[PDB]
Amino acid sequence: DLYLRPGDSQIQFTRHASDVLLNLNRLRSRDILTDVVIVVSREQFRAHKTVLMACSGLFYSIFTDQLKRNLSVINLDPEINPEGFNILLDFMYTSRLNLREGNIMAVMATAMYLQMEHVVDTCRKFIKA
Amino acid sequence: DLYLRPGDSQIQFTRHASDVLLNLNRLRSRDILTDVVIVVSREQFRAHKTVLMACSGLFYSIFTDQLKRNLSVINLDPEINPEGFNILLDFMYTSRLNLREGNIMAVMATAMYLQMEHVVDTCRKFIKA
Ligand SMILES: [Cl-]
Ligand SMILES: [Cl-]
């Protein structure tokens, strides 16, 4: 629960990061302080820009551009499949990835588009088996 | 790095939550998408409202009030010590708590005011020894 480590006098909390993400997912479930809608083939997904930027290289690049920083709606490539995006948005807020035989190619394609390198790497590992 | 668990078919990522928090702290360091300033005895601290709400019962209560939701400046009780607040803001974004003999009473008092129950519990454990 707590531990100490070398070269650093601070107390380390093992559960804090998971608790923060859990509470951020609760905010999303309740639509509290969400500040962007992502549009994927007419499907709409509400989210927190900071969480998107902390998980996706695409969204990091988008919202660090001064012109795009304050946009409230982001339209993605119409070829992106909404189910794949939904799975990856859930992953962002949960650390849990719904990979199945029937969606892994779409999830991998969407994670490459979003620049989510650890999801892509994981997809390639499962494909190889 | 990855694991499976019962009652849930999804892949579990062990490092994701810590990576999200690390990237959120990077956004804070760069002042990217910060949306509130907390004022503590004339000292000013920039932060992300969603992270404050995910860590502090006080900030959760504040920003779920419709009148206070869009405030850009929050003034805290003038008796709160800025060093204690700084230590707890760092903890929110890092899972690391700078507890010392010389600050533990102030940090505990500030964590009670912010309603950060796991920090308070930890302070009481260290005090008892
Ligand atoms: Cl990733
Ligand atoms: Cl806490």
PDB file of C-alpha atoms and ligand atoms in Angstrom:
ATOM      1  CA  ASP A   1       0.000   0.000   0.000  1.00  0.00           C
ATOM      2  CA  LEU A   2       2.866   2.301   0.970  1.00  0.00           C
ATOM      3  CA  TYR A   3       6.579   1.819   0.353  1.00  0.00           C
ATOM      4  CA  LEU A   4       9.944   3.612   0.393  1.00  0.00           C
ATOM      5  CA  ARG A   5      12.580   3.688  -2.339  1.00  0.00           C
ATOM      6  CA  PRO A   6      16.195   4.842  -2.775  1.00  0.00           C
ATOM      7  CA  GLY A   7      17.268   8.285  -3.901  1.00  0.00           C
ATOM      8  CA  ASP A   8      13.896   9.734  -2.895  1.00  0.00           C
ATOM      9  CA  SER A   9      12.710  10.489   0.624  1.00  0.00           C
ATOM     10  CA  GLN A  10       9.015  10.618  -0.273  1.00  0.00           C
ATOM     11  CA  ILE A  11       6.398   8.003   0.642  1.00  0.00           C
ATOM     12  CA  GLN A  12       5.215   6.020  -2.392  1.00  0.00           C
ATOM     13  CA  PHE A  13       1.474   5.226  -2.658  1.00  0.00           C
ATOM     14  CA  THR A  14       0.838   2.066  -4.686  1.00  0.00           C
ATOM     15  CA  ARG A  15      -2.907   2.548  -5.222  1.00  0.00           C
ATOM     16  CA  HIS A  16      -3.119   6.292  -5.908  1.00  0.00           C
ATOM     17  CA  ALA A  17      -2.791   6.333  -9.717  1.00  0.00           C
ATOM     18  CA  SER A  18      -5.431   3.620 -10.115  1.00  0.00           C
ATOM     19  CA  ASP A  19      -7.716   5.525  -7.732  1.00  0.00           C
ATOM     20  CA  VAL A  20      -7.275   8.737  -9.754  1.00  0.00           C
ATOM     21  CA  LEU A  21      -8.145   6.964 -13.000  1.00  0.00           C
ATOM     22  CA  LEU A  22     -11.150   5.281 -11.365  1.00  0.00           C
ATOM     23  CA  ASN A  23     -12.458   8.664 -10.242  1.00  0.00           C
ATOM     24  CA  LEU A  24     -11.828  10.177 -13.677  1.00  0.00           C
ATOM     25  CA  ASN A  25     -13.887   7.369 -15.218  1.00  0.00           C
ATOM     26  CA  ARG A  26     -16.641   8.164 -12.701  1.00  0.00           C
ATOM     27  CA  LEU A  27     -16.588  11.790 -13.852  1.00  0.00           C
ATOM     28  CA  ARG A  28     -16.930  10.564 -17.434  1.00  0.00           C
ATOM     29  CA  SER A  29     -19.848   8.284 -16.531  1.00  0.00           C
ATOM     30  CA  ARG A  30     -21.616  11.279 -14.947  1.00  0.00           C
ATOM     31  CA  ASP A  31     -20.627  13.714 -17.742  1.00  0.00           C
ATOM     32  CA  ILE A  32     -18.926  15.943 -15.162  1.00  0.00           C
ATOM     33  CA  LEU A  33     -16.485  18.501 -16.614  1.00  0.00           C
ATOM     34  CA  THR A  34     -16.263  16.710 -19.942  1.00  0.00           C
ATOM     35  CA  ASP A  35     -15.069  19.324 -22.417  1.00  0.00           C
ATOM     36  CA  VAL A  36     -14.931  17.637 -25.847  1.00  0.00           C
ATOM     37  CA  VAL A  37     -17.022  15.383 -28.082  1.00  0.00           C
ATOM     38  CA  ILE A  38     -15.242  13.011 -30.474  1.00  0.00           C
ATOM     39  CA  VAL A  39     -17.309  12.212 -33.583  1.00  0.00           C
ATOM     40  CA  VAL A  40     -16.709   8.825 -35.227  1.00  0.00           C
ATOM     41  CA  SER A  41     -18.948   7.997 -38.211  1.00  0.00           C
ATOM     42  CA  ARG A  42     -21.804  10.059 -36.716  1.00  0.00           C
ATOM     43  CA  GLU A  43     -21.269   8.351 -33.336  1.00  0.00           C
ATOM     44  CA  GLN A  44     -20.462  10.764 -30.498  1.00  0.00           C
ATOM     45  CA  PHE A  45     -18.183  10.194 -27.495  1.00  0.00           C
ATOM     46  CA  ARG A  46     -17.764  12.658 -24.629  1.00  0.00           C
ATOM     47  CA  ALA A  47     -14.418  12.843 -22.853  1.00  0.00           C
ATOM     48  CA  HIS A  48     -11.907  14.974 -20.946  1.00  0.00           C
ATOM     49  CA  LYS A  49      -9.270  16.553 -23.199  1.00  0.00           C
ATOM     50  CA  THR A  50      -6.522  16.070 -20.604  1.00  0.00           C
ATOM     51  CA  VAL A  51      -7.183  12.331 -20.381  1.00  0.00           C
ATOM     52  CA  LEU A  52      -7.191  12.033 -24.173  1.00  0.00           C
ATOM     53  CA  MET A  53      -3.879  13.918 -24.293  1.00  0.00           C
ATOM     54  CA  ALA A  54      -2.387  11.728 -21.566  1.00  0.00           C
ATOM     55  CA  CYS A  55      -3.215   8.539 -23.539  1.00  0.00           C
ATOM     56  CA  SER A  56      -3.113   9.371 -27.258  1.00  0.00           C
ATOM     57  CA  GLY A  57      -0.350  10.945 -29.314  1.00  0.00           C
ATOM     58  CA  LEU A  58      -2.970  12.136 -31.791  1.00  0.00           C
ATOM     59  CA  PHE A  59      -4.961  14.035 -29.168  1.00  0.00           C
ATOM     60  CA  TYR A  60      -1.760  15.347 -27.603  1.00  0.00           C
ATOM     61  CA  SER A  61      -0.754  16.804 -30.985  1.00  0.00           C
ATOM     62  CA  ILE A  62      -4.235  18.188 -31.616  1.00  0.00           C
ATOM     63  CA  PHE A  63      -4.756  20.087 -28.372  1.00  0.00           C
ATOM     64  CA  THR A  64      -1.222  21.504 -28.142  1.00  0.00           C
ATOM     65  CA  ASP A  65      -1.936  23.323 -31.422  1.00  0.00           C
ATOM     66  CA  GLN A  66      -3.136  26.793 -30.446  1.00  0.00           C
ATOM     67  CA  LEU A  67      -5.813  26.846 -33.147  1.00  0.00           C
ATOM     68  CA  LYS A  68      -7.270  23.491 -32.044  1.00  0.00           C
ATOM     69  CA  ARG A  69      -6.772  23.825 -28.266  1.00  0.00           C
ATOM     70  CA  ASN A  70     -10.287  25.161 -27.570  1.00  0.00           C
ATOM     71  CA  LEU A  71     -12.261  23.086 -30.081  1.00  0.00           C
ATOM     72  CA  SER A  72     -15.259  21.361 -28.494  1.00  0.00           C
ATOM     73  CA  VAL A  73     -15.837  18.838 -31.322  1.00  0.00           C
ATOM     74  CA  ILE A  74     -13.178  16.692 -33.018  1.00  0.00           C
ATOM     75  CA  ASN A  75     -14.113  14.704 -36.121  1.00  0.00           C
ATOM     76  CA  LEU A  76     -11.982  11.633 -36.793  1.00  0.00           C
ATOM     77  CA  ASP A  77     -11.226   9.929 -40.113  1.00  0.00           C
ATOM     78  CA  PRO A  78     -14.573   8.515 -41.351  1.00  0.00           C
ATOM     79  CA  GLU A  79     -12.880   5.148 -41.931  1.00  0.00           C
ATOM     80  CA  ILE A  80     -12.409   4.718 -38.163  1.00  0.00           C
ATOM     81  CA  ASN A  81     -14.900   2.216 -36.759  1.00  0.00           C
ATOM     82  CA  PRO A  82     -16.884   3.477 -33.726  1.00  0.00           C
ATOM     83  CA  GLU A  83     -16.686   0.181 -31.820  1.00  0.00           C
ATOM     84  CA  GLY A  84     -12.893   0.240 -31.979  1.00  0.00           C
ATOM     85  CA  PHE A  85     -12.850   3.823 -30.736  1.00  0.00           C
ATOM     86  CA  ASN A  86     -15.274   2.975 -27.915  1.00  0.00           C
ATOM     87  CA  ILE A  87     -13.023   0.098 -26.805  1.00  0.00           C
ATOM     88  CA  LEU A  88      -9.970   2.366 -26.751  1.00  0.00           C
ATOM     89  CA  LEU A  89     -11.749   5.208 -24.941  1.00  0.00           C
ATOM     90  CA  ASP A  90     -12.788   2.700 -22.258  1.00  0.00           C
ATOM     91  CA  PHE A  91      -9.180   1.511 -22.081  1.00  0.00           C
ATOM     92  CA  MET A  92      -7.936   5.077 -21.569  1.00  0.00           C
ATOM     93  CA  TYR A  93     -10.151   5.439 -18.486  1.00  0.00           C
ATOM     94  CA  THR A  94      -9.807   1.875 -17.080  1.00  0.00           C
ATOM     95  CA  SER A  95      -6.455   0.191 -18.009  1.00  0.00           C
ATOM     96  CA  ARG A  96      -8.631  -2.667 -19.369  1.00  0.00           C
ATOM     97  CA  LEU A  97      -8.696  -3.585 -23.075  1.00  0.00           C
ATOM     98  CA  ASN A  98     -11.585  -5.530 -24.642  1.00  0.00           C
ATOM     99  CA  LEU A  99      -9.635  -7.524 -27.239  1.00  0.00           C
ATOM    100  CA  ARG A 100     -11.453 -10.308 -29.090  1.00  0.00           C
ATOM    101  CA  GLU A 101     -10.841 -12.347 -32.224  1.00  0.00           C
ATOM    102  CA  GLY A 102     -13.588 -10.334 -33.918  1.00  0.00           C
ATOM    103  CA  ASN A 103     -12.284  -6.854 -33.117  1.00  0.00           C
ATOM    104  CA  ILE A 104      -8.504  -7.067 -32.746  1.00  0.00           C
ATOM    105  CA  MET A 105      -7.711  -5.885 -36.278  1.00  0.00           C
ATOM    106  CA  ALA A 106     -10.061  -2.898 -35.926  1.00  0.00           C
ATOM    107  CA  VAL A 107      -8.777  -2.088 -32.440  1.00  0.00           C
ATOM    108  CA  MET A 108      -5.186  -2.241 -33.658  1.00  0.00           C
ATOM    109  CA  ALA A 109      -5.958  -0.013 -36.649  1.00  0.00           C
ATOM    110  CA  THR A 110      -7.697   2.502 -34.405  1.00  0.00           C
ATOM    111  CA  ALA A 111      -4.875   2.466 -31.840  1.00  0.00           C
ATOM    112  CA  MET A 112      -2.337   3.169 -34.601  1.00  0.00           C
ATOM    113  CA  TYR A 113      -4.432   6.137 -35.768  1.00  0.00           C
ATOM    114  CA  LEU A 114      -4.683   7.420 -32.171  1.00  0.00           C
ATOM    115  CA  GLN A 115      -0.938   6.747 -31.620  1.00  0.00           C
ATOM    116  CA  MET A 116      -1.421   4.505 -28.578  1.00  0.00           C
ATOM    117  CA  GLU A 117       1.830   2.583 -28.794  1.00  0.00           C
ATOM    118  CA  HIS A 118       1.379   0.154 -25.896  1.00  0.00           C
ATOM    119  CA  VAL A 119      -2.032  -0.968 -27.161  1.00  0.00           C
ATOM    120  CA  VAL A 120      -0.590  -1.455 -30.664  1.00  0.00           C
ATOM    121  CA  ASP A 121       2.301  -3.490 -29.246  1.00  0.00           C
ATOM    122  CA  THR A 122      -0.138  -5.611 -27.243  1.00  0.00           C
ATOM    123  CA  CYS A 123      -2.312  -6.233 -30.311  1.00  0.00           C
ATOM    124  CA  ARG A 124       0.708  -7.404 -32.304  1.00  0.00           C
ATOM    125  CA  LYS A 125       1.666  -9.807 -29.498  1.00  0.00           C
ATOM    126  CA  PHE A 126      -1.787 -11.409 -29.434  1.00  0.00           C
ATOM    127  CA  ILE A 127      -1.904 -11.600 -33.238  1.00  0.00           C
ATOM    128  CA  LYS A 128       1.446 -13.412 -33.271  1.00  0.00           C
ATOM    129  CA  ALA A 129      -0.217 -16.139 -31.185  1.00  0.00           C
TER     130      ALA A 129
ATOM    131  CA  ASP B   1       2.916  -5.765 -17.625  1.00  0.00           C
ATOM    132  CA  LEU B   2      -0.257  -7.470 -18.840  1.00  0.00           C
ATOM    133  CA  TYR B   3      -2.437  -9.968 -16.996  1.00  0.00           C
ATOM    134  CA  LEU B   4      -5.835 -11.697 -17.061  1.00  0.00           C
ATOM    135  CA  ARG B   5      -8.360 -11.987 -14.242  1.00  0.00           C
ATOM    136  CA  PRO B   6     -11.599 -13.874 -13.503  1.00  0.00           C
ATOM    137  CA  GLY B   7     -15.078 -12.639 -14.305  1.00  0.00           C
ATOM    138  CA  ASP B   8     -13.692 -10.227 -16.903  1.00  0.00           C
ATOM    139  CA  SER B   9     -12.445 -11.101 -20.372  1.00  0.00           C
ATOM    140  CA  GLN B  10     -10.469  -7.885 -20.854  1.00  0.00           C
ATOM    141  CA  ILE B  11      -6.672  -7.566 -20.824  1.00  0.00           C
ATOM    142  CA  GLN B  12      -5.400  -5.756 -17.718  1.00  0.00           C
ATOM    143  CA  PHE B  13      -2.548  -3.233 -18.164  1.00  0.00           C
ATOM    144  CA  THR B  14      -0.479  -2.858 -14.989  1.00  0.00           C
ATOM    145  CA  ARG B  15       1.380   0.325 -15.963  1.00  0.00           C
ATOM    146  CA  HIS B  16      -1.374   2.348 -17.654  1.00  0.00           C
ATOM    147  CA  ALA B  17      -2.736   4.318 -14.674  1.00  0.00           C
ATOM    148  CA  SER B  18       0.758   5.370 -13.591  1.00  0.00           C
ATOM    149  CA  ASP B  19       1.539   6.390 -17.180  1.00  0.00           C
ATOM    150  CA  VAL B  20      -1.640   8.503 -17.352  1.00  0.00           C
ATOM    151  CA  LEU B  21      -0.779  10.293 -14.113  1.00  0.00           C
ATOM    152  CA  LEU B  22       2.808  10.845 -15.282  1.00  0.00           C
ATOM    153  CA  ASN B  23       1.540  12.472 -18.470  1.00  0.00           C
ATOM    154  CA  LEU B  24      -0.959  14.590 -16.531  1.00  0.00           C
ATOM    155  CA  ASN B  25       1.900  15.845 -14.351  1.00  0.00           C
ATOM    156  CA  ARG B  26       3.812  16.687 -17.542  1.00  0.00           C
ATOM    157  CA  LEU B  27       0.838  18.741 -18.732  1.00  0.00           C
ATOM    158  CA  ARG B  28       0.874  20.561 -15.395  1.00  0.00           C
ATOM    159  CA  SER B  29       4.618  21.235 -15.635  1.00  0.00           C
ATOM    160  CA  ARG B  30       4.054  22.774 -19.089  1.00  0.00           C
ATOM    161  CA  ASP B  31       0.858  24.631 -18.062  1.00  0.00           C
ATOM    162  CA  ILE B  32      -1.052  22.808 -20.810  1.00  0.00           C
ATOM    163  CA  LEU B  33      -4.856  22.901 -20.450  1.00  0.00           C
ATOM    164  CA  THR B  34      -4.696  23.948 -16.815  1.00  0.00           C
ATOM    165  CA  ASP B  35      -8.055  25.545 -16.076  1.00  0.00           C
ATOM    166  CA  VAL B  36      -7.946  26.752 -12.447  1.00  0.00           C
ATOM    167  CA  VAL B  37      -5.671  28.646 -10.065  1.00  0.00           C
ATOM    168  CA  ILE B  38      -5.801  27.809  -6.350  1.00  0.00           C
ATOM    169  CA  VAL B  39      -4.842  30.763  -4.130  1.00  0.00           C
ATOM    170  CA  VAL B  40      -3.277  29.941  -0.751  1.00  0.00           C
ATOM    171  CA  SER B  41      -2.152  32.935   1.341  1.00  0.00           C
ATOM    172  CA  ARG B  42      -1.387  34.938  -1.829  1.00  0.00           C
ATOM    173  CA  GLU B  43       0.500  31.939  -3.269  1.00  0.00           C
ATOM    174  CA  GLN B  44      -0.901  30.680  -6.584  1.00  0.00           C
ATOM    175  CA  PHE B  45      -1.043  27.095  -7.874  1.00  0.00           C
ATOM    176  CA  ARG B  46      -2.228  26.120 -11.353  1.00  0.00           C
ATOM    177  CA  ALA B  47      -3.948  22.772 -11.826  1.00  0.00           C
ATOM    178  CA  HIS B  48      -6.497  20.717 -13.764  1.00  0.00           C
ATOM    179  CA  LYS B  49      -9.959  20.743 -12.172  1.00  0.00           C
ATOM    180  CA  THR B  50     -10.581  17.090 -13.064  1.00  0.00           C
ATOM    181  CA  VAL B  51      -7.417  15.961 -11.280  1.00  0.00           C
ATOM    182  CA  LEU B  52      -8.318  18.030  -8.218  1.00  0.00           C
ATOM    183  CA  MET B  53     -11.797  16.466  -8.230  1.00  0.00           C
ATOM    184  CA  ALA B  54     -10.362  12.965  -8.612  1.00  0.00           C
ATOM    185  CA  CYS B  55      -8.135  13.435  -5.518  1.00  0.00           C
ATOM    186  CA  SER B  56      -9.895  15.828  -3.128  1.00  0.00           C
ATOM    187  CA  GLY B  57     -13.376  15.649  -1.646  1.00  0.00           C
ATOM    188  CA  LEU B  58     -13.308  19.421  -1.215  1.00  0.00           C
ATOM    189  CA  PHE B  59     -12.638  20.090  -4.896  1.00  0.00           C
ATOM    190  CA  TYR B  60     -15.137  17.412  -5.899  1.00  0.00           C
ATOM    191  CA  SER B  61     -17.816  19.209  -3.858  1.00  0.00           C
ATOM    192  CA  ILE B  62     -16.798  22.614  -5.200  1.00  0.00           C
ATOM    193  CA  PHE B  63     -16.872  21.873  -8.922  1.00  0.00           C
ATOM    194  CA  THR B  64     -20.051  19.764  -8.866  1.00  0.00           C
ATOM    195  CA  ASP B  65     -21.874  22.879  -7.620  1.00  0.00           C
ATOM    196  CA  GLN B  66     -23.317  24.547 -10.713  1.00  0.00           C
ATOM    197  CA  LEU B  67     -22.463  28.040  -9.474  1.00  0.00           C
ATOM    198  CA  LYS B  68     -18.811  27.128  -8.818  1.00  0.00           C
ATOM    199  CA  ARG B  69     -18.249  24.732 -11.746  1.00  0.00           C
ATOM    200  CA  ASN B  70     -16.783  27.378 -14.084  1.00  0.00           C
ATOM    201  CA  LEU B  71     -14.791  29.419 -11.559  1.00  0.00           C
ATOM    202  CA  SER B  72     -11.192  29.976 -12.665  1.00  0.00           C
ATOM    203  CA  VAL B  73      -9.854  31.021  -9.228  1.00  0.00           C
ATOM    204  CA  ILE B  74     -10.495  29.243  -5.914  1.00  0.00           C
ATOM    205  CA  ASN B  75      -9.396  30.912  -2.679  1.00  0.00           C
ATOM    206  CA  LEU B  76      -8.738  28.559   0.228  1.00  0.00           C
ATOM    207  CA  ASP B  77      -8.974  29.253   3.964  1.00  0.00           C
ATOM    208  CA  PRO B  78      -6.213  31.807   4.732  1.00  0.00           C
ATOM    209  CA  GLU B  79      -5.039  29.599   7.610  1.00  0.00           C
ATOM    210  CA  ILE B  80      -3.913  26.925   5.121  1.00  0.00           C
ATOM    211  CA  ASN B  81      -0.133  26.918   4.751  1.00  0.00           C
ATOM    212  CA  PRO B  82       1.111  27.096   1.125  1.00  0.00           C
ATOM    213  CA  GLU B  83       3.914  24.558   1.623  1.00  0.00           C
ATOM    214  CA  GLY B  84       1.430  21.953   2.832  1.00  0.00           C
ATOM    215  CA  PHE B  85      -0.799  22.620  -0.163  1.00  0.00           C
ATOM    216  CA  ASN B  86       2.174  22.404  -2.546  1.00  0.00           C
ATOM    217  CA  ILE B  87       3.143  19.017  -1.074  1.00  0.00           C
ATOM    218  CA  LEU B  88      -0.394  17.691  -1.516  1.00  0.00           C
ATOM    219  CA  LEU B  89      -0.774  19.047  -5.056  1.00  0.00           C
ATOM    220  CA  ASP B  90       2.473  17.262  -5.970  1.00  0.00           C
ATOM    221  CA  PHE B  91       1.101  14.103  -4.355  1.00  0.00           C
ATOM    222  CA  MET B  92      -2.091  14.323  -6.428  1.00  0.00           C
ATOM    223  CA  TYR B  93      -0.041  14.283  -9.643  1.00  0.00           C
ATOM    224  CA  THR B  94       2.714  11.822  -8.566  1.00  0.00           C
ATOM    225  CA  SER B  95       1.530   9.289  -5.899  1.00  0.00           C
ATOM    226  CA  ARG B  96       4.552  10.504  -3.862  1.00  0.00           C
ATOM    227  CA  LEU B  97       4.156  12.318  -0.525  1.00  0.00           C
ATOM    228  CA  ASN B  98       6.911  14.523   0.935  1.00  0.00           C
ATOM    229  CA  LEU B  99       6.342  13.831   4.639  1.00  0.00           C
ATOM    230  CA  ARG B 100       8.939  15.101   7.114  1.00  0.00           C
ATOM    231  CA  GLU B 101       9.090  15.658  10.859  1.00  0.00           C
ATOM    232  CA  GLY B 102       8.879  19.395  10.182  1.00  0.00           C
ATOM    233  CA  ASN B 103       5.796  19.373   7.957  1.00  0.00           C
ATOM    234  CA  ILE B 104       3.673  16.364   8.913  1.00  0.00           C
ATOM    235  CA  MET B 105       1.281  18.292  11.164  1.00  0.00           C
ATOM    236  CA  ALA B 106       0.727  20.953   8.485  1.00  0.00           C
ATOM    237  CA  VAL B 107       0.365  18.348   5.738  1.00  0.00           C
ATOM    238  CA  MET B 108      -2.152  16.412   7.816  1.00  0.00           C
ATOM    239  CA  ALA B 109      -4.146  19.564   8.591  1.00  0.00           C
ATOM    240  CA  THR B 110      -4.188  20.513   4.919  1.00  0.00           C
ATOM    241  CA  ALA B 111      -5.186  17.001   3.816  1.00  0.00           C
ATOM    242  CA  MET B 112      -8.108  17.045   6.270  1.00  0.00           C
ATOM    243  CA  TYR B 113      -9.259  20.388   4.836  1.00  0.00           C
ATOM    244  CA  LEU B 114      -8.958  19.007   1.279  1.00  0.00           C
ATOM    245  CA  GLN B 115     -10.675  15.740   2.352  1.00  0.00           C
ATOM    246  CA  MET B 116      -7.864  13.454   1.177  1.00  0.00           C
ATOM    247  CA  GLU B 117      -8.602  10.489   3.406  1.00  0.00           C
ATOM    248  CA  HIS B 118      -5.718   8.189   2.457  1.00  0.00           C
ATOM    249  CA  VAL B 119      -3.135  10.919   3.059  1.00  0.00           C
ATOM    250  CA  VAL B 120      -4.731  11.706   6.439  1.00  0.00           C
ATOM    251  CA  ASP B 121      -4.677   8.016   7.381  1.00  0.00           C
ATOM    252  CA  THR B 122      -1.025   7.777   6.350  1.00  0.00           C
ATOM    253  CA  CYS B 123      -0.114  10.853   8.406  1.00  0.00           C
ATOM    254  CA  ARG B 124      -1.769   9.371  11.493  1.00  0.00           C
ATOM    255  CA  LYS B 125       0.179   6.124  11.015  1.00  0.00           C
ATOM    256  CA  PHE B 126       3.526   7.932  10.866  1.00  0.00           C
ATOM    257  CA  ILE B 127       2.612  10.126  13.844  1.00  0.00           C
ATOM    258  CA  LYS B 128       1.788   7.029  15.901  1.00  0.00           C
ATOM    259  CA  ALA B 129       5.410   5.947  15.385  1.00  0.00           C
TER     260      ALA B 129
HETATM  261 CL    CL C   1      -1.102   2.977 -25.083  1.00  0.00          CL
HETATM  262 CL    CL C   2      -5.937  10.614  -0.519  1.00  0.00          CL
END
